[PDB]
Amino acid sequence: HGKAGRKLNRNSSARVALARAQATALLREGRIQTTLTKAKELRPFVEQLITTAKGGDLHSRRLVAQDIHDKDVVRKVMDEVAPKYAERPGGYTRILRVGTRRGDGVTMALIEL
Amino acid sequence: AKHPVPKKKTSKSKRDMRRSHHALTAPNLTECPQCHGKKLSHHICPNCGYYDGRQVLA
Amino acid sequence: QTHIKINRGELLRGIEQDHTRQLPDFRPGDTVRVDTKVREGNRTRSQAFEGVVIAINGSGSRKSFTVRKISFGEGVERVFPFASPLVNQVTIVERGKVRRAKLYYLRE
Amino acid sequence: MKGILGTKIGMTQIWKNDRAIPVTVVLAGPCPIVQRKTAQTDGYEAVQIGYAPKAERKVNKPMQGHFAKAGVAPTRILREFRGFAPDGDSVNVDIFAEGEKIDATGTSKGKGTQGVMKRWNFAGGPASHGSKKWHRRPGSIGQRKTPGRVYKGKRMAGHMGMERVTVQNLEVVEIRAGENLILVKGAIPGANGGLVVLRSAAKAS
Amino acid sequence: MIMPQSRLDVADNSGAREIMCIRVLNSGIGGKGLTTGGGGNKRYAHVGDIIVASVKDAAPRGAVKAGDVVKAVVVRTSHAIKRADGSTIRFDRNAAVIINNQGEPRGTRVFGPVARELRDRRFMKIVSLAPEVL
RNA sequence: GAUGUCGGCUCGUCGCAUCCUGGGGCUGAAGAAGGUCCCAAGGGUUGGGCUGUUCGCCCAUUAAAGCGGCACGCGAGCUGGGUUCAGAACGUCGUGAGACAGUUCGGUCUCUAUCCGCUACGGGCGCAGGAGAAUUGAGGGGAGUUGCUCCUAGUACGAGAGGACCGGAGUGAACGGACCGCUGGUCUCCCUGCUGUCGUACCAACGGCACAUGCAGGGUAGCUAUGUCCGGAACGGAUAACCGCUGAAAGCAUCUAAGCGGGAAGCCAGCCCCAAGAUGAGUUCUCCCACUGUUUAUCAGGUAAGACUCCCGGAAGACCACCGGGUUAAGAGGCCAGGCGUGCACGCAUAGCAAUGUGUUCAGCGGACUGGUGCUCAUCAGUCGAGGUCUUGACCA
RNA sequence: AUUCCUUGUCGGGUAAGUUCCGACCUGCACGAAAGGCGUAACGAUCUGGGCGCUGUCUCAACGAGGGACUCGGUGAAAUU
RNA sequence: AAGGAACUUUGCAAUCUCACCCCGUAACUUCGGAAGAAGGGGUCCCCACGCUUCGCGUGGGGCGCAGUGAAUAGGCCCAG
């Protein structure tokens, strides 16, 4: 059987680079579009990650730094975006599948903060 | 060489007996609520850019 | 399969708090489980395994601790079910200072 | 004969005296009675019990009538039992008795498409002394110009699991009425959350 | 578990030091002498099981010599015998006690602890020299 | 204009002239143990050493450790040890080139399955309405093994030594099924430790790469066995060999020609699983109901019950299929709580020349596990889907 | 590596050895520069044994990655 | 896991071993070798001290399961 729970399609150190790679962007742009699935993967990781930032103390700042190697972005998340989702019960990030693409026939989608 | 190989040409008939299942399924287009143009249920209307509000730029 | 609403989580706990016993603290360092060997004929014996603890795998009815001992020139390890009827009482003897929840590293 | 529906729930440890025994905690909720089949209506005697509940907003119109035909309250699962009866609704209280041996019958966890080594044991072969048929792959399907085919049933890969199963004679260890909970020794089929049916020994010693 | 080609330590003064397994007899102690195997299969010797063996190293000066085919009765499997209370016992090394057709140790004493399962197997005398019976 | 060759391995299946278990006659059969002939193939028939072996000899066991068939079963299934290519050697034969009853070391065994067959899984249509669901069982498949101890009984038997049938108990083995609570395995980034190097300016804290986890320690869920649980049954029907009751033809005798009974691991039923495409297409409960279309558009078209499409999932799964949810919502992510793994974090303080230690800290971090919560997305909407043939017969006022 | 009878015979090592080592000899058909017998060292050489270690095996299990499967693009082959 | 060549035509294949210091090292021999024979110990960090400096030795101290702490990196022997 295969009753686990996670997605891959690359090795291990990659499915880690990606999720960090997209993690930043979304945080740096608020919205990025991407293959539908990769969004779906992306979602929960950024959220947890946003929830990390939602503490303000060095520690939390430094845990995030682990998954955000661009100083700026981390500060953005740390000081601009994280302080805002305070009031809400963690859970902001939505997806709006768009329409199939052309060169590969893959359905894209939008993941916006 | 090419080890397994076919024992005869297949009838233009049989070769069709097969294909009776490659028939595409026409999308289920739905009519946008605003642009009234047809969209793909659950996705953004490629024409107006809406999905209750307007997401995608024009 | 059936979709009844239910917290299987607790349904279990109930059928498991009738069979769950708490013991001293301990994590590593010496112990002296003075068990009972009721097993002989009718004659109910009284053994007392005792020495290093090297694991606490578990929680609830299934919780258990493992202790390593060298009896008469040959290593010995026993797996004790906290709630195991054959056990009367466990007792520390000397808290140990180690750095990991296993120790196997000590099996040599 | 007798019997009641239930849900698997999990196994755990339990001591009956001084001998620890593993047990599969099953919950045989109270079961409704939604149709008494009789060798005079359906040409055969039997009963129809119900199980999990169901919101009426999901309940088809026709299904409502069938359940309403006894004023029960849409279940979502119905199953027959031969040569049974009682009056009202069927629970395990009085039904099964601590000590009875039973036949639990769930649905095997589904193993997807499995080879022969796994679905029939087989033995595959080598792993080092020459190959391309490393471990799994069946050896040979048959003989030659004789039975110039393969037999009907030769074991080969296939979907394994997701089959009905029955593990006979299980000792109903404990029985917590007031919770339609029951505890059986040994392992029952299918996974937790699964529908299991518990009956009287199909035929026991 | 213990099996053919698997060498055990000897837990007696029979003179034998180490022994290689040869065949797992279905440990038949009972009745009058040792009983005749209960099957020609049975692949693993679990503590308190009898096996036929072959001495691979006996000590100099001792009733048992190097190369003597002899029966023994496993007393310590590095496996793990699970006691009915659900406890588990496992020794560092596999070790057996050479014996004789009545289930008696050819030795005058056992060394090292012995599986308590042997009392179950009715191997009384063996047990009686056991410094311990874990 | 090619039917690949010995032996293994894998995978099996069939016959019986049965190797062991079942039943029986006779025995020179006391009992126990055997011999032998009959009936009987359900199932089972071990692991090692030598040899390319088949064979066979042997070690240790076993209830036994059957013989044969299926292109000396099985290379579009694997090997390639054997032997009927090219190299080389020895003995032997040949003046020689070469040869061989011979011996010896070496020597590329071809990804792509069309038809039948086979294992799984879908689509169509059919089953005289359109639908939801629960079933009968025609038939079919799986399984079908055996030891040992105890009891009876130290009896029957036997000079004794030894020592049962029958019947009743237990406990293994191998084989299968299911299962993961246990005991273990794994767990590719769930936690930590460690090295070299580059970067995050630097210090400190971290990241990358040294597998496709840099190494190590451990490890939830899942899956998993060497772990657990259960099973091979009982009774029954009809019988084989075999034993018999009443009993003539042969006024006796006879298991028989009338008739009747006992009787095997086998057969049929029984157990578990499939199953009406059982086109002879069954049964039962429930729901929607009788719309519209001028001999110019002759049948389709709104629609009911209901369901698909699609979205979000799943202990379901290759795809399909199957189960669940889709805001009258707790389906999944998140989020809180908790559980469980790791084993005490950053930072700061203090001790120490320092490496480090101690405290704050049973800390910190966190995959899949138990719950709670409308934070996020399951929006909107479309597509398909009944008006019930006829004949006979029966009942209704 | 020259033996047909042959797994010769006795010994050795093994629980058990048609192979291996040691003898004996009855050398089917050894033998002295087609060299006889020996020999330290050297061999991706050939044979037999042993220690160690291991998934070779008892039995397999879990995990990873690349195909195999699904959808969009391009689209062969032997064969008949 | 347990076992450890039971695999098999043959441990084929894959492990173990695997660097550099120190101790130690057989038969046999053309005395050169056999020899990396076999076998065992060490190896990180801190500080003092002395040394020929990079480096190193001594003494004490320290941390972890583990210190050529990750990559490169002999498995050994007996007999023919």
Swiss-Prot record, chain A:
It comes from the Bacteria. InterPro entries: Ribosomal_bL17 (IPR000456), Ribosomal_bL17_CS (IPR047859), Ribosomal_bL17_sf (IPR036373). Signal peptide: none annotated. The keyword Nucleotide-binding does not apply. GO terms for cellular component: cytosolic large ribosomal subunit. GO terms for molecular function: rRNA binding; structural constituent of ribosome. Keywords: Ribonucleoprotein, Ribosomal protein, RNA-binding, rRNA-binding. Pfam families: Ribosomal_L17. The keyword Ribonucleoprotein applies. GO terms for biological process: translation. Belongs to the bacterial ribosomal protein bL17 family. Binds to the 23S rRNA. Part of the 50S ribosomal subunit. Contacts proteins L3 and L32. This is Large ribosomal subunit protein bL17.
UniProtKB/Swiss-Prot annotation, chain B:
Keywords: Metal-binding, Ribonucleoprotein, Ribosomal protein, RNA-binding, rRNA-binding, Zinc, Zinc-finger. InterPro entries: Ribosomal_bL32, Ribosomal_bL32_bact, Ribosomal_zn-bd. Residues 1-33 are annotated as: Disordered. One of its GO terms (biological process) is translation. One of its GO terms (molecular function) is structural constituent of ribosome. The keyword Membrane does not apply. Its cofactor is Zn(2+). One of its GO terms (cellular component) is large ribosomal subunit. Residues 1-22 have a biased composition (Basic residues). Zn(2+) binds at residues 32, 35, 45, 48. A zinc finger (C4-type) spans 32-48. It holds the Pfam family Ribosomal_L32p. Binds 1 zinc ion per subunit. Belongs to the bacterial ribosomal protein bL32 family. Part of the 50S ribosomal subunit. Contacts proteins L17 and L22. Forms a cluster with L17 and L22, and with L22, a pair of 'tweezers' that hold together all the domains of the 23S rRNA. Interacts with the antibiotic troleandomycin which blocks the peptide exit tunnel. This is Large ribosomal subunit protein bL32. It comes from Deinococcus radiodurans (strain ATCC 13939 / DSM 20539 / JCM 16871 / CCUG 27074 / LMG 4051 / NBRC 15346 / NCIMB 9279 / VKM B-1422 / R1). The lineage of its organism: Bacteria, Thermotogati, Deinococcota, Deinococci, Deinococcales.
Swiss-Prot record, chain C:
GO terms for molecular function: rRNA binding; structural constituent of ribosome. Keywords: Ribonucleoprotein, Ribosomal protein, RNA-binding, rRNA-binding. One of its GO terms (cellular component) is cytosolic large ribosomal subunit. GO terms for biological process: translation. It comes from the Bacteria. Part of the 50S ribosomal subunit. Forms a cluster with proteins L3 and L14. Belongs to the bacterial ribosomal protein bL19 family. This protein is located at the 30S-50S ribosomal subunit interface and may play a role in the structure and function of the aminoacyl-tRNA binding site. Binds the 23S rRNA. This is Large ribosomal subunit protein bL19. It comes from Deinococcus radiodurans (strain ATCC 13939 / DSM 20539 / JCM 16871 / CCUG 27074 / LMG 4051 / NBRC 15346 / NCIMB 9279 / VKM B-1422 / R1). The gene is rplS.
Swiss-Prot record, chain E:
Transmembrane segments: none annotated. The keyword RNA-binding applies. InterPro entries: Ribosomal_uL14 (IPR000218), Ribosomal_uL14_bac-type (IPR005745), Ribosomal_uL14_CS (IPR019972), Ribosomal_uL14_sf (IPR036853). One of its GO terms (biological process) is translation. One of its GO terms (molecular function) is large ribosomal subunit rRNA binding. GO terms for cellular component: cytosolic large ribosomal subunit. Coiled coil: none annotated. Keywords: Ribonucleoprotein, Ribosomal protein, RNA-binding, rRNA-binding. In the 70S ribosome, L14 and L19 interact and together make contacts with the 16S rRNA in bridges B5 and B8. Part of the 50S ribosomal subunit. Forms a cluster with proteins L3 and L19. Forms part of two intersubunit bridges in the 70S ribosome. Binds to 23S rRNA. PANTHER family: 50S/60S RIBOSOMAL PROTEIN L14/L23 (PTHR11761), LARGE RIBOSOMAL SUBUNIT PROTEIN UL14M (PTHR11761:SF3). HAMAP family: Ribosomal_uL14. Belongs to the universal ribosomal protein uL14 family. This is Large ribosomal subunit protein uL14. It comes from Deinococcus radiodurans (strain ATCC 13939 / DSM 20539 / JCM 16871 / CCUG 27074 / LMG 4051 / NBRC 15346 / NCIMB 9279 / VKM B-1422 / R1).
